[PDB]
Scaffold this active site. Structure first.
Site, short mmCIF file in Angstrom:
data_model
loop_
_atom_site.label_atom_id
_atom_site.label_comp_id
_atom_site.label_asym_id
_atom_site.label_seq_id
_atom_site.Cartn_x
_atom_site.Cartn_y
_atom_site.Cartn_z
N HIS A 1 -7.87 -5.33 10.11
CA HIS A 1 -7.53 -5.00 8.74
C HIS A 1 -6.22 -5.63 8.34
CE1 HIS A 1 -5.57 -1.02 10.17
NE2 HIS A 1 -4.58 -1.68 9.62
N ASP B 1 0.78 -1.21 0.00
CA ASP B 1 0.00 0.00 0.00
C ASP B 1 0.82 1.27 0.00
OD1 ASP B 1 -1.24 -0.66 3.44
OD2 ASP B 1 0.81 -0.60 2.64
N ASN C 1 -8.49 -3.59 14.36
CA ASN C 1 -9.80 -4.01 13.88
C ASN C 1 -9.77 -5.20 12.90
OD1 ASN C 1 -8.76 -2.87 11.57
ND2 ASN C 1 -10.40 -1.35 11.28
N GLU D 1 -10.21 -2.53 5.15
CA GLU D 1 -10.96 -2.34 6.39
C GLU D 1 -12.14 -3.29 6.49
OE1 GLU D 1 -9.43 -0.53 8.57
OE2 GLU D 1 -8.98 1.54 7.94
#
Length: 241
Positions: free
Chosen positions: A138, A67, A136, A143
Site C-alpha cells: 500500500h 492521509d 502489502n 490498499e
C-alpha cells in the site's frame, strides 16, 4: 525508478532530508507532500537539524499530507495532525496556515475528500511527495485493489494495516476502522516521488516492487508509471531482493 541502497536507517534519513531540502531551496515557494509513520521519523529529525546547522528556512513552504484517520480530532494523540505538529511543524519557521491535512473530524467525510482533492489541485500539485510502503504494497492507505485512477477518498483499512499500526495505540481496539487518503492518481501527479523503505518487515515488498510487475493487487507498482521516482532502501529492507 532510481534505487539507492543505504547502509543504515540514519543514512537513509540524511539522504531523504537532503533531497527534501533541495526541493525547498530550488524555488521560492515549494509544495511538499508529506507522510507519517515510523519510516520518515528520522527524515523529520534531520530536516529540523538542517534548520539549525545549515540555516534552512521553511518560511515560504506549503505542505500537504497523504492521509488522516476518520473520526480523530486534531488534538487526539494518534491523529496525523498531531504527529505532524509534534514531529515537524512545531520545530520550524513555516506559516501554520499553509500546512494542509485531511480533516478526519469533518461532518461529511466524502465531501471533505472532494474539498481536499480540490485544494491539492489548486496548489498546483506537489513538488515532491514523500511516501512509505506497506507490507502489502500500500501507498497512503491505498490498499490492494485500489484503482490507479483513484483520487482522495474514504477507505476501510485492511486488517494487516490495523495490525501494523496498533503499536502506536493503547490497544488494537482503539485503532480506527476508516481513513481518508490521497488517491493513487493524486500521488502520481507530484513532480517527484521519494519512497522511503526501512526494516526487514518490508523486505517482501521491496522484492515485489523491484521485479516490476504492475497490478492493482500491489499499489506501489503504480510508481513504475511515474517519470521521477527515487527509492531509498536500507540494508534490512533490501535483504530479500
Amino acid at each position: 525508478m532510481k534505487v539507492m541502497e543505504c547502509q543504515t536507517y540514519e543514512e537513509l534519513s540524511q539522504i531523504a532530508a537532503r533531497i527534501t531540502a533541495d526541493t525547498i531551496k530550488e524555488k521560492p515557494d515549494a509544495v511538499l507532500g508529506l507522510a507519517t509513520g515510523g519510516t520518515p521519523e528520522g527524515t523529520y529529525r534531520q530536516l529540523i537539524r538542517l534548520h539549525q546547522t545549515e540555516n534552512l528556512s521553511f518560511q515560504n513552504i506549503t505542505t500537504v499530507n497523504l492521509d488522516e484517520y476518520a473520526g480523530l480530532s486534531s488534538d487526539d494523540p494518534n491523529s496525523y495532525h498531531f504527529y505532524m505538529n509534534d514531529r515537524f511543524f512545531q520545530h520550524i519557521d513555516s506559516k501554520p496556515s499553509r500546512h494542509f491535512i485531511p480533516n478526519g473530524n469533518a461532518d461529511d467525510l466524502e465531501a471533505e475528500c472532494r474539498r481536499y482533492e480540490q485544494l491539492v489541485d489548486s496548489l498546483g500539485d506537489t513538488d515532491i511527495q514523500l511516501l512509505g510502503i506497506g507490507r502489502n504494497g500500500h501507498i497512503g492507505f491505498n490498499e490492494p485493489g485500489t484503482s490507479f485512477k483513484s483520487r482522495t477518498h474514504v477507505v476501510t483499512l485492511n486488517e494487516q494495516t490495523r495490525q501494523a499500526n496498533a503499536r502506536y495505540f493503547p490497544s488494537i481496539d482503539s485503532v480506527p476502522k476508516k481513513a481518508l487518503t490521497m488517491g493513487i492518481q493524486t500521488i502520481l501527479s507530484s513532480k517527484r516521488i521519494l519512497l522511503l523503505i526501512s526494516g526487514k518487515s518490508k523486505a517482501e515488498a521491496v522484492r515485489k516492487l523491484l521485479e516490476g510487475n504492475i497490478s492493482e493487487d500491489f499499489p506501489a507498482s503504480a510508481l513504475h508509471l511515474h517519470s521521477d521516482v527515487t527509492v531509498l532502501i536500507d540494508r534490512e529492507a533490501a535483504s530479500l531482493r
